Amino acid sequence: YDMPTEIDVRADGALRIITLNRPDSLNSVNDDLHVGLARLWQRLTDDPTARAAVITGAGRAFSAGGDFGYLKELSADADLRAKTIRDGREIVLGMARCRIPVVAAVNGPAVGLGCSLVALSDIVYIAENAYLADPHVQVGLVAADGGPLTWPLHISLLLAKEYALTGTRISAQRAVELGLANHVADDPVAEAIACAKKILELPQQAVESTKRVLNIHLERAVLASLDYALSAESQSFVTEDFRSIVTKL
Amino acid sequence: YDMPTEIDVRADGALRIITLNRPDSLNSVNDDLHVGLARLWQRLTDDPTARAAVITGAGRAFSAGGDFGYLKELSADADLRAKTIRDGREIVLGMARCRIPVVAAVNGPAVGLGCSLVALSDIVYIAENAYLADPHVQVGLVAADGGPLTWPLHISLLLAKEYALTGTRISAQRAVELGLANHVADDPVAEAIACAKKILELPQQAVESTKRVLNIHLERAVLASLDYALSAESQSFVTEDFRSIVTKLADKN
Amino acid sequence: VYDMPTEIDVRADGALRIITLNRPDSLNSVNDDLHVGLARLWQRLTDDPTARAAVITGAGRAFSAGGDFGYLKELSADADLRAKTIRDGREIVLGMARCRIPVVAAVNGPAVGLGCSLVALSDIVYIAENAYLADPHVQVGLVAADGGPLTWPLHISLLLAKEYALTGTRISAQRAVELGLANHVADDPVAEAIACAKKILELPQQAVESTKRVLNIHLERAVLASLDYALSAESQSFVTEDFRSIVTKLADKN
Amino acid sequence: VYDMPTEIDVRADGALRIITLNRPDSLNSVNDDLHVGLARLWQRLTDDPTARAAVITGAGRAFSAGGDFGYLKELSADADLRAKTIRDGREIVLGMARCRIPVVAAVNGPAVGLGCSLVALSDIVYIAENAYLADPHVQVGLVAADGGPLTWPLHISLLLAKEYALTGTRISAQRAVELGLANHVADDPVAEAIACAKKILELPQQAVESTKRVLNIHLERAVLASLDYALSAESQSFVTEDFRSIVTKL
Amino acid sequence: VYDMPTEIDVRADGALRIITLNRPDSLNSVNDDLHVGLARLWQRLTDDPTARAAVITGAGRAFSAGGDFGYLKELSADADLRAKTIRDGREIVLGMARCRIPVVAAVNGPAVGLGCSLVALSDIVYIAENAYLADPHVQVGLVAADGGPLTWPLHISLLLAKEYALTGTRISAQRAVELGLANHVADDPVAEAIACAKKILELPQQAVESTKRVLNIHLERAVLASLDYALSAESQSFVTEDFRSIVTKLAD
Amino acid sequence: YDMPTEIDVRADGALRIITLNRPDSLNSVNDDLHVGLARLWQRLTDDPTARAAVITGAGRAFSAGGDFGYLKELSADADLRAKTIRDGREIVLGMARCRIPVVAAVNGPAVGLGCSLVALSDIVYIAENAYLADPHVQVGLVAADGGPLTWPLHISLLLAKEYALTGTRISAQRAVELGLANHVADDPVAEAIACAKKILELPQQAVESTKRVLNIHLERAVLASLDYALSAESQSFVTEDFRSIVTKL
Ligand SMILES: [Ca+2]
Ligand SMILES: [Ca+2]
Ligand SMILES: [Ca+2]
Ligand SMILES: [Ca+2]
Ligand SMILES: [Ca+2]
Ligand SMILES: [Ca+2]
Numbered sequence A, F: 001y002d003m004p005t006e007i008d009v010r011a012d013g014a015l016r017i018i019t020l021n022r023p024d025s026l027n028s029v030n031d032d033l034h035v036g037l038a039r040l041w042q043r044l045t046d047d048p049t050a051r052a053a054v055i056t057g058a059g060r061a062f063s064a065g066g067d068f069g070y071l072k073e074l075s076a077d078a079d080l081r082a083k084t085i086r087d088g089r090e091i092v093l094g095m096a097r098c099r100i101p102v103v104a105a106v107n108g109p110a111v112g113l114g115c116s117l118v119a120l121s122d123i124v125y126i127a128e129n130a131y132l133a134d135p136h137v138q139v140g141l142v143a144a145d146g147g148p149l150t151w152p153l154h155i156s157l158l159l160a161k162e163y164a165l166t167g168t169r170i171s172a173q174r175a176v177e178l179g180l181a182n183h184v185a186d187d188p189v190a191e192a193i194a195c196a197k198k199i200l201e202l203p204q205q206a207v208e209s210t211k212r213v214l215n216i217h218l219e220r221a222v223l224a225s226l227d228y229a230l231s232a233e234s235q236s237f238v239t240e241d242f243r244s245i246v247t248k249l
Numbered sequence B: 001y002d003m004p005t006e007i008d009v010r011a012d013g014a015l016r017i018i019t020l021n022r023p024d025s026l027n028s029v030n031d032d033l034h035v036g037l038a039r040l041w042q043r044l045t046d047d048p049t050a051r052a053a054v055i056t057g058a059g060r061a062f063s064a065g066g067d068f069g070y071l072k073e074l075s076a077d078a079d080l081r082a083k084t085i086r087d088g089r090e091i092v093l094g095m096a097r098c099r100i101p102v103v104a105a106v107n108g109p110a111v112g113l114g115c116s117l118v119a120l121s122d123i124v125y126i127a128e129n130a131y132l133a134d135p136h137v138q139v140g141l142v143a144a145d146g147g148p149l150t151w152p153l154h155i156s157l158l159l160a161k162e163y164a165l166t167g168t169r170i171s172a173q174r175a176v177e178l179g180l181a182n183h184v185a186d187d188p189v190a191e192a193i194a195c196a197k198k199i200l201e202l203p204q205q206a207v208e209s210t211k212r213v214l215n216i217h218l219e220r221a222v223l224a225s226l227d228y229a230l231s232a233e234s235q236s237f238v239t240e241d242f243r244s245i246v247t248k249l250a251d252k253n
Numbered sequence C: 001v002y003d004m005p006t007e008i009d010v011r012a013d014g015a016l017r018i019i020t021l022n023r024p025d026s027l028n029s030v031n032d033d034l035h036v037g038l039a040r041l042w043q044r045l046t047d048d049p050t051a052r053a054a055v056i057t058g059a060g061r062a063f064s065a066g067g068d069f070g071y072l073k074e075l076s077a078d079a080d081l082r083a084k085t086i087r088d089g090r091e092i093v094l095g096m097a098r099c100r101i102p103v104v105a106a107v108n109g110p111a112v113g114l115g116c117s118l119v120a121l122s123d124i125v126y127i128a129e130n131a132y133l134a135d136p137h138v139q140v141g142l143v144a145a146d147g148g149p150l151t152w153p154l155h156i157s158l159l160l161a162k163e164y165a166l167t168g169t170r171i172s173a174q175r176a177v178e179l180g181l182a183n184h185v186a187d188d189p190v191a192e193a194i195a196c197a198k199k200i201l202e203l204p205q206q207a208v209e210s211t212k213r214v215l216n217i218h219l220e221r222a223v224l225a226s227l228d229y230a231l232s233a234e235s236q237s238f239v240t241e242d243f244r245s246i247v248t249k250l251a252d253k254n
Numbered sequence D: 001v002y003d004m005p006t007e008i009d010v011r012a013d014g015a016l017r018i019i020t021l022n023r024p025d026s027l028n029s030v031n032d033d034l035h036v037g038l039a040r041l042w043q044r045l046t047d048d049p050t051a052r053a054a055v056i057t058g059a060g061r062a063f064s065a066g067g068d069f070g071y072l073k074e075l076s077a078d079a080d081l082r083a084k085t086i087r088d089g090r091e092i093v094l095g096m097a098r099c100r101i102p103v104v105a106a107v108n109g110p111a112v113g114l115g116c117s118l119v120a121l122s123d124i125v126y127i128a129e130n131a132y133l134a135d136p137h138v139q140v141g142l143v144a145a146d147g148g149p150l151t152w153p154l155h156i157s158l159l160l161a162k163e164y165a166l167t168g169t170r171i172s173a174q175r176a177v178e179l180g181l182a183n184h185v186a187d188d189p190v191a192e193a194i195a196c197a198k199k200i201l202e203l204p205q206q207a208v209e210s211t212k213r214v215l216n217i218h219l220e221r222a223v224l225a226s227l228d229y230a231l232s233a234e235s236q237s238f239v240t241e242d243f244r245s246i247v248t249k250l
Numbered sequence E: 001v002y003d004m005p006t007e008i009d010v011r012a013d014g015a016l017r018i019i020t021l022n023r024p025d026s027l028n029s030v031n032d033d034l035h036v037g038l039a040r041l042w043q044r045l046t047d048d049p050t051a052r053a054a055v056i057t058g059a060g061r062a063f064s065a066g067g068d069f070g071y072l073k074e075l076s077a078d079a080d081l082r083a084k085t086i087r088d089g090r091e092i093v094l095g096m097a098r099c100r101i102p103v104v105a106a107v108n109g110p111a112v113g114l115g116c117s118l119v120a121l122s123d124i125v126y127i128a129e130n131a132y133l134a135d136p137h138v139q140v141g142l143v144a145a146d147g148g149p150l151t152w153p154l155h156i157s158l159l160l161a162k163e164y165a166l167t168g169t170r171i172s173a174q175r176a177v178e179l180g181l182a183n184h185v186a187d188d189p190v191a192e193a194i195a196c197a198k199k200i201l202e203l204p205q206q207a208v209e210s211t212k213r214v215l216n217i218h219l220e221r222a223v224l225a226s227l228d229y230a231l232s233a234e235s236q237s238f239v240t241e242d243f244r245s246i247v248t249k250l251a252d
């Protein structure tokens, strides 16, 4: 798929396994990983030999959120900021529109973008000790990357607002209770792969159209709020509140 | 309301009891049951002597889904196909816009369309051992009849995706917890009747307009996706995948 | 500073505003003044930059018991007042949906009718152990237009919204939190809501206010689809024999 | 034919249906029976596979002069007839918006009030040289709810729709065509709309029917946004003194 | 007046209100005081039961020649004023959209930028023979977010709304009526608008006000869809070096 | 931009000239031109050095629509059909979301997909004796390319309905009278290039943000009906009506 180092795509028949691949840095999102995720979904859509994906992270985390270095660049580099905003748009719309089922295997913390990738998936398996969180607000940023943007399709709006506003950690058990996750698994990668291979035996036209039927609701909610969210996040990158916090850490 | 035998309608004052009536086939859907459902909602809306309904199934099930013979005919006959699509649309739009409250008494399995009727009701009572399921995808069909379509109004979209794609049976308890049903009942038809009867004592104009206020959301969601959904299921009927799954399922010697 | 009447006390504590529904003797029931004040408050908070967060609660044992029977009787008899209350009813919903600052509810006691709609329109909700939510509009001959059943489908299953709205069932604190109609049960909801708002106040402003906005776009889209219909239908129920007859019994206080 | 009343004549001519509003002594003003007919018709057309296209027109000199004053005074005095008429008005609008077959309008004379709404809901419109469109709801103390102004923004500037709905301006045949409220000025709108429909009849059915649905999605979204409120507000009109007073004189 | 600043005169003539932008020396260009008054007024019109129709026009030669340059210059430097002018910008748009009474514009001279937006947001528009409409936002480094181009798609072709919001080209009185941006060309548009509003005053209140809401539902939907994005972007525009450059030149 | 031969892209500073390139065939649409078109718009969005585009056709026509051999192929080939549908969607979604202003130089007939691309552009110049037309229906296909689908944003729904159903040729003068085009031109290509050039001088963030504000209204329309529309054009590739008409052509 012409991915970079930080995104390993492996082929097993009509399955694709996607592994976020910065395990030493807990899959924190740098420019390279970000651009990779922007491009990947349309590519899956356009490859007829792919019929399903699994997304997971290498090592202990799914993704711990933004890379501090990447973040500090974003607050001083306008060209980089404009590109990240385009790509950000393409991840959300890439996954919203993606042809094939995507099964998430949350092996570890999924924070920020990680947490948004999980809300944009079709079925989610999560490890007992893993959690979801979005700490955008606590760090000085509008949560635009897809988490809070998509959470009201999954949970109550009250709950969405509280977790977006305060960076609440959502445990594996709680996420399943809420419908932010489908199953707690001991081995979420394995359980994910078996659910995707199960889906691969089903009639293709039926599988692909039914995902599109449901994702229309997702796409409606995205077109309503995404341009404003991205625009506002862009303004937050240049706030003293953000610049200060992202310098300390 | 000029229903065919497979939809029994009983009046009890201002109440209508709607019983799906092919009990020996687990009330599975044939053309007559389908057509009747398509016409029924508008005729209730226009009968000012009706102000509430209960819908249930005769015998052990609420509805086991499509009659395999009906489904096989649908893969072969383009005219019948186009008809079923029109009538399917009318069931969904018909319920969405139905003037009177509709209380489901799910007496056993509500599968495929049955499960969609339950999603389009206002209040659901469900028996302890009944379940909800939509096995459209397992069988080669796009789930358009109104279940998965409207499930996201009741439940997490992630959970709607999973159940639409895997055809999981949803127990009465799991359903009540999820908000796909309202109460578990020893006698769901008795409890539905009582529920509807309380609603009949209440001021009509408040009851009717308040349903309308809440169903606008349902209508907004259906308008976004029903046409596409129906067109896709129209194509599903003609696929080799579906022909081969249904030609086995309909082969009964 | 916000030209509120007696029936809405508003208190400043730094950048926090504490809003108290203030008719304790009537269990904070809605009369015209309380309705007008609620209509005008939210824009005035948005425009006060010294304000950055708000807590809303009730004086005495109740959050709000809903409609003042005297007022409701007057509404079934006065077409001018009716048209005004519809206008102000749109402003409460629109004002809260569009309000710049996070609003945390402290449901100290029953939140009924307009009461529970103010709750459904808040951002974070703390509820007392013995408090409950209810909307008895339909039992009383009125369409539930206030913002309750109107907004409920964004928190809970539509099936459940249809039941609770058609029957007026009471939703206990434990049940509300189980359902997503509230965030937390509290021994002391006012203290807990105040601490929650004060914790938010420490967060970067532009991030908090923008994030409320992103989330409330979904709420505004839902309100815009049904609000004018809902309020127009409620207008009509004030003039029904059903309501006129029910509200005459209720407004009969010797 | 379709169990219509006398007030609505439906004629078949192969796969075409010709719908003629039928109270020419009253300029096809709308009474209850015509109104109920209009609500039932479209779903029945939709459900008749031997029907593939419609033309709609008026008997005699008018297309339709709008609201029969007898009906309207009756509507102002009886809550149950109000509730039924709102219910049916809803069905006319959704009926035509959801209708399977192409509907071609032949506007033979004035199309006023509801009649002008029938035109806006049609797919192609031929209008006689001397004919006009108007919606007089407001000047009569009624909210303009039953499809006209409600639908006009899909045809014309919102500014123009607002002015015409508030002032009840007459829109001439030429002027209708200049705005896109009508497709062609016709000497014989009945005949020209009949040939239009026969032309569409020869085209591939599935292409024709699906294309209508594609464009009417935009119509349906605009209606769904506003119809419930407009009908509710018009129900309130029937009951005001301003209306009771104006309709008494008329 | 209605607590308007001097920059907005409101005169009462029975149930009628005449709203007059009142900085003729600067051709009614938009400063901060005018902007605030425009934000506050609409809700106050809606809440005054003794008002039932309104006309809006400009003192002197122009209806309004868009932003005061001095004002736009502050907006490039003061962040608090920026956030405030964005808040009130929403209120002009949402307040006009939701306003109870019909509003009839008398475009007596050029309506530029915000002026052109107030016209788009009106119910019925009368325009002088030598007047015109324009939005030069883009030529000046600003996103056109005030409610002009935001709203133009409900009146005209999207292709045309794009041409004019991009090129900033002027729309003559005659061309505006032809497109659907104006209702009537007038010799004396103040007088034609006043007469139009008076006719409307004679009509049954409930029918007028409801019919306005029915139609404005479409404007409200179009605004909700793009306003928050639009104002956020125009906000980013104010801090751009393109705008700082352009505006510093124009105010010196 | 890795574009096929059938789509020429030329650079002139920040300008991109897009010339549809099958002149001997009146730039009629085959699979490769179709794939090129689907892939183009995101690549333009992502090339920061492109800031405006002009689209036109080589030779005497803008585009005469579907390639007959291509359409016959589509009637008989399941996979080719599903692919053309995916790409058709990207053409529409790519144009609607394209960052940069696109100016159309309609140099001759723009028929079918031709007038759909015109409909999706932001400013249009049309030559004196050119016309817009969509004959999808008369050949047996639901008019889903984006033409009729976009028209109600430009013109009365009544006229859209008529032009779509009857395949009416819309003259250059009528197109401008309705606002299906902006100007009649002696040399549409020069006037377009000059207009695009004028735009390139304007402040970029104002230009690009303003396009987005406006195209949100386009994107709302497209999202409401595109999937139904593309699914119905798929069903019509498979009708006897279409097969007969295409085969005898
Ligand atoms: Ca982010
Ligand atoms: Ca039978
Ligand atoms: Ca039979
Ligand atoms: Ca089915
Ligand atoms: Ca109320
Ligand atoms: Ca009427």
Ligand SMILES: [Ca+2]
Pocket (backbone or CB within 6 Å): E114, E137, E142, E143, E144, E145, E146, E234
């Ligand atoms: Ca501006």
Ligand SMILES: [Ca+2]
Pocket (backbone or CB within 6 Å): F136, F141, F142, F143, F144, F145, F233
């Ligand atoms: Ca095509």
Ligand SMILES: [Cl-]
Pocket (backbone or CB within 6 Å): A012, A013, A014, A015, A200
């Ligand atoms: Cl495989």
Ligand SMILES: [Cl-]
Pocket (backbone or CB within 6 Å): none
């Ligand atoms: Cl919408």
